[PDB]
Protein backbone atom coordinates (compact mmCIF):
# COMPACT_ATOMS: atom_id res chain seq x y z
CA UNK A 1 0.00 0.00 0.00
CA UNK A 2 2.59 2.49 1.25
CA UNK A 3 5.20 -0.01 0.02
CA UNK A 4 5.28 2.31 -3.00
CA UNK A 5 7.37 4.54 -0.70
CA UNK A 6 9.58 1.53 0.14
CA UNK A 7 10.42 0.76 -3.47
CA UNK A 8 11.02 4.46 -4.11
CA UNK A 9 13.43 4.79 -1.21
CA UNK A 10 15.33 1.62 -2.24
CA UNK A 11 15.57 3.00 -5.75
CA UNK A 12 16.70 6.39 -4.52
CA UNK A 13 19.41 4.72 -2.51
CA UNK A 14 20.56 2.70 -5.51
CA UNK A 15 20.68 5.81 -7.73
CA UNK A 16 22.71 7.59 -5.07
CA UNK A 17 25.07 4.61 -4.86
CA UNK A 18 25.63 4.54 -8.62
CA UNK A 19 26.30 8.26 -8.63
CA UNK A 20 28.83 7.86 -5.80
CA UNK A 21 30.50 5.08 -7.73
CA UNK A 22 30.81 7.37 -10.77
CA UNK A 23 32.27 10.04 -8.53
CA UNK A 24 34.74 7.54 -7.12
CA UNK A 25 35.72 6.46 -10.63
CA UNK A 26 36.67 10.02 -11.39
CA UNK A 27 38.49 10.76 -8.15
CA UNK A 28 40.27 7.37 -8.17
CA UNK A 29 41.50 8.00 -11.73
CA UNK A 30 42.73 11.46 -10.78
CA UNK A 31 44.31 10.21 -7.56
CA UNK A 32 46.16 7.45 -9.40
CA UNK A 33 47.42 9.89 -12.04
CA UNK A 34 48.58 12.08 -9.15
CA UNK A 35 50.40 9.21 -7.48
CA UNK A 36 52.09 8.35 -10.75
CA UNK A 37 53.13 11.94 -11.37
CA UNK A 38 54.53 12.26 -7.83
CA UNK A 39 56.67 9.17 -8.33
CA UNK A 40 57.91 10.42 -11.69
CA UNK A 41 58.68 13.80 -10.12
CA UNK A 42 60.76 12.16 -7.43
CA UNK A 43 62.64 10.17 -10.04
CA UNK A 44 63.36 13.31 -12.03
CA UNK A 45 64.60 15.15 -8.94
CA UNK A 46 66.92 12.29 -8.10
CA UNK A 47 68.21 12.10 -11.68
CA UNK A 48 68.86 15.83 -11.77
CA UNK A 49 70.81 15.54 -8.53
CA UNK A 50 72.99 12.76 -9.87
CA UNK A 51 73.57 14.50 -13.20
CA UNK A 52 74.52 17.75 -11.48
CA UNK A 53 76.98 15.95 -9.22
CA UNK A 54 78.57 14.32 -12.26
CA UNK A 55 78.65 17.67 -14.06
CA UNK A 56 80.51 19.32 -11.16
CA UNK A 57 82.90 16.37 -10.96
CA UNK A 58 83.75 16.75 -14.63
CA UNK A 59 84.10 20.51 -14.42
CA UNK A 60 86.58 19.97 -11.60
CA UNK A 61 88.54 17.49 -13.69
CA UNK A 62 88.67 20.00 -16.55
CA UNK A 63 89.93 22.90 -14.41
CA UNK A 64 92.27 20.32 -12.73
Amino acid sequence: EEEKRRVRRERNKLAAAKCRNRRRELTDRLQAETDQLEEEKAELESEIAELQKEKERLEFVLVA
Binding site: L30, T34, L37, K41, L51, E54, L58, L62
Partner: protein, 68 residues
Amino acid sequence: SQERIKAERKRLRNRIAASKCRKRKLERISRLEEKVKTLKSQNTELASTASLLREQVAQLKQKVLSHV
Protein backbone atom coordinates in the same frame (compact mmCIF):
# COMPACT_ATOMS: atom_id res chain seq x y z
CA SER B 1 -1.41 22.58 7.91
CA GLN B 2 1.16 21.09 10.26
CA GLU B 3 1.51 18.18 7.85
CA ARG B 4 2.34 20.41 4.87
CA ILE B 5 4.85 22.32 6.98
CA LYS B 6 6.51 19.19 8.27
CA ALA B 7 6.87 17.67 4.81
CA GLU B 8 8.26 20.79 3.16
CA ARG B 9 10.75 21.47 5.93
CA LYS B 10 12.01 17.91 5.72
CA ARG B 11 12.52 18.09 1.98
CA LEU B 12 14.27 21.44 2.27
CA ARG B 13 16.69 20.30 5.00
CA ASN B 14 17.47 17.32 2.75
CA ARG B 15 18.12 19.68 -0.18
CA ILE B 16 20.55 21.81 1.83
CA ALA B 17 22.38 18.68 2.93
CA ALA B 18 22.51 17.55 -0.71
CA SER B 19 23.79 20.84 -2.16
CA LYS B 20 26.46 21.29 0.52
CA CYS B 21 27.64 17.73 -0.09
CA ARG B 22 27.78 18.47 -3.83
CA LYS B 23 29.85 21.58 -3.15
CA ARG B 24 32.29 19.48 -1.13
CA LYS B 25 32.53 16.82 -3.85
CA LEU B 26 33.15 19.27 -6.67
CA GLU B 27 35.75 21.14 -4.65
CA ARG B 28 37.65 17.93 -3.99
CA ILE B 29 37.54 17.04 -7.67
CA SER B 30 38.78 20.49 -8.62
CA ARG B 31 41.72 20.33 -6.22
CA LEU B 32 42.72 16.94 -7.67
CA GLU B 33 42.46 18.32 -11.22
CA GLU B 34 44.62 21.31 -10.30
CA LYS B 35 47.19 19.08 -8.62
CA VAL B 36 47.48 16.92 -11.73
CA LYS B 37 47.97 20.04 -13.83
CA THR B 38 50.58 21.45 -11.44
CA LEU B 39 52.50 18.20 -11.41
CA LYS B 40 52.51 17.89 -15.18
CA SER B 41 53.94 21.41 -15.38
CA GLN B 42 56.55 20.79 -12.68
CA ASN B 43 57.62 17.57 -14.35
CA THR B 44 57.89 19.29 -17.73
CA GLU B 45 60.31 21.75 -16.17
CA LEU B 46 62.27 18.97 -14.47
CA ALA B 47 62.42 16.83 -17.59
CA SER B 48 63.82 19.70 -19.62
CA THR B 49 66.39 20.39 -16.91
CA ALA B 50 67.37 16.72 -16.82
CA SER B 51 67.76 16.46 -20.61
CA LEU B 52 69.85 19.62 -20.68
CA LEU B 53 72.08 18.17 -18.00
CA ARG B 54 72.46 14.85 -19.80
CA GLU B 55 73.60 16.72 -22.89
CA GLN B 56 76.00 18.92 -20.90
CA VAL B 57 77.56 16.00 -19.04
CA ALA B 58 78.02 14.23 -22.35
CA GLN B 59 79.85 17.26 -23.76
CA LEU B 60 82.09 17.52 -20.70
CA LYS B 61 82.97 13.85 -21.01
CA GLN B 62 84.04 14.46 -24.59
CA LYS B 63 86.29 17.30 -23.37
CA VAL B 64 87.89 15.01 -20.80
CA LEU B 65 88.54 12.48 -23.56
CA SER B 66 90.16 15.24 -25.64
CA HIS B 67 93.09 15.22 -23.19
CA VAL B 68 93.78 11.52 -22.65
